[PDB]
Structure formats: C-alpha cells, structure tokens
Amino acid sequence: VRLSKTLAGILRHHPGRYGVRLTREGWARVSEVVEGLRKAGWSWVEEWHIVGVALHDPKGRYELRNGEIRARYGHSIPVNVEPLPGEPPPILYHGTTEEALPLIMERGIMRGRRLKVHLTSSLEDAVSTGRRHGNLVAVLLVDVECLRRRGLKVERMSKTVYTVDWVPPECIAEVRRESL
Numbered sequence: 001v002r003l004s005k006t007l008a009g010i011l012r013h014h015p016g017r018y019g020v021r022l023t024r025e026g027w028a029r030v031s032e033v034v035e036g037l038r039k040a041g042w043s044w045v046e047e048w049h050i051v052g053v054a055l056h057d058p059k060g061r062y063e064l065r066n067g068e069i070r071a072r073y074g075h076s077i078p079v080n081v082e083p084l085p086g087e088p089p090p091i092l093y094h095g096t097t098e099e100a101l102p103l104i105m106e107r108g109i110m111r112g113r114r115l116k117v118h119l120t121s122s123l124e125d126a127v128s129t130g131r132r133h134g135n136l137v138a139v140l141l142v143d144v145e146c147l148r149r150r151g152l153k154v155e156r157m158s159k160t161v162y163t164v165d166w167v168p169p170e171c172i173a174e175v176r177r178e179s180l
C-alpha cells in the first residue's frame with residue numbers, strides 16, 4: 001500500500017511481476033514502472049510520484065537518469081551497480097534478531113535472500129532494519145578493517161549503505177541486545 005516500499009520490491013525482487021524489464025545494470029524505464037503499477041491497480045500513480053519517491057528517499061535507495069530508475073542495493077536479482085566514492089568507516093552496523101545471534105556467533109553474517117550482506121553507517125538505520133524482521137533487535141558492530149584483511153571487499157552503494165559477501169564471526173566487534 002506504500003508506494004516506495006512497493007517500488008523497492010519491483011526493482012530489487014520482482015520486475016516482470018509488474019511487467020518491468022531490467023538491464024544487467026539494474027535500470028528500468030519510469031514509464032514502464034508507472035504503467036506496471038497502474039495495471040496493478042494503482043490508478044493515480046504518475047511519473048512525478050516516482051521521481052519524488054526517488055529524489056526524496058532518505059537512504060538514497062534509488063538512482064535516476066534520462067527517464068530511468070533502479071535500486072542502488074538490496075537486490076535479490078543478479079545485477080551490477082557500481083559503488084560510490086568514499087572509503088568505509090572503521091565500524092559499520094548491521095541489525096538483525098537476537099534469535100539470529102546464536103548461529104551468527106558461529107557462522108557470522110550470511111547472505112540471506114539478498115545477493116550481498118548489507119552494512120550501515122547509521123546506527124538508527126540498523127535498528128529500524130532489525131525491527132523489520134522479527135522483534136528483539138540485535139545490532140552488531142562490524143570491524144571493517146578486519147574484513148579487508150580477510151580479503152573481503154567492501155563496496156559503497158549509497159551514502160550510508162555498504163555491502164560485502166559475508167561478515168566473518170571474528171570481524172564482529174560488538175553485539176548490542178535491545179532487550180538489555
């Protein structure tokens with residue numbers, strides 16, 4: 001029912017479901033997205049909403065170019081999006097469920113349905129993120145350098161969002177249980 005939430009699903013997980021075709025670079029035509037949303041019963045949707053959604057997103061979730069749009073990260077579909085300039089901070093956060101900690105302590109942070117593992121520089125974001133699946137959020141502090149030495153590359157997809165294949169258990173510097 002939320003336009004943005006729905007848009008991110010279309011550009012990250014199910015284009016065709018809405019008749020939208022994406023390139024390897026992840027791009028899509030705004031018009032094609034608009035029609036697709038209309039055919040899905042969103043009658044009032046117009047191209048300007050889509051631009052508004054993209055230009056006002058706080059996380060910098062989307063990108064635009066000559067009548068096109070794509071998500072910058074969070075894809076569960078194979079796609080290639082180039083990173084943004086800027087070395088990562090020494091520590092990056094990642095939210096999740098306390099219930100996931102037992103496993104994570106052993107295995108570390110695993111991929112999930114998304115292609116790569118996402119890490120945020122914003123503590124607040126990590127919380128709301130954890131709060132999205134299951135409750136009793138547990139935010140983990142990830143030592144980036146530790147990752148780089150593990151050889152795992154850390155790429156910047158948006159001002160506050162970065163990704164890596166996985167986070168080794170040993171690169172977790174702190175676990176904070178919201179229940180404590």
Ligand SMILES: [Cl-]
Nearest residue numbers: 014015016017
């Ligand atoms: Cl699909």
Ligand SMILES: [Cl-]
Nearest residue numbers: 008009012074
């Ligand atoms: Cl998602």
Ligand SMILES: [Cl-]
Nearest residue numbers: 059061074129
């Ligand atoms: Cl998100």
Ligand SMILES: [Cl-]
Nearest residue numbers: 112114117118
């Ligand atoms: Cl993730």
Ligand SMILES: [Cl-]
Nearest residue numbers: 085086159160
């Ligand atoms: Cl910056």
Ligand SMILES: [Zn+2]
Nearest residue numbers: 051052055056
């Ligand atoms: Zn606006």
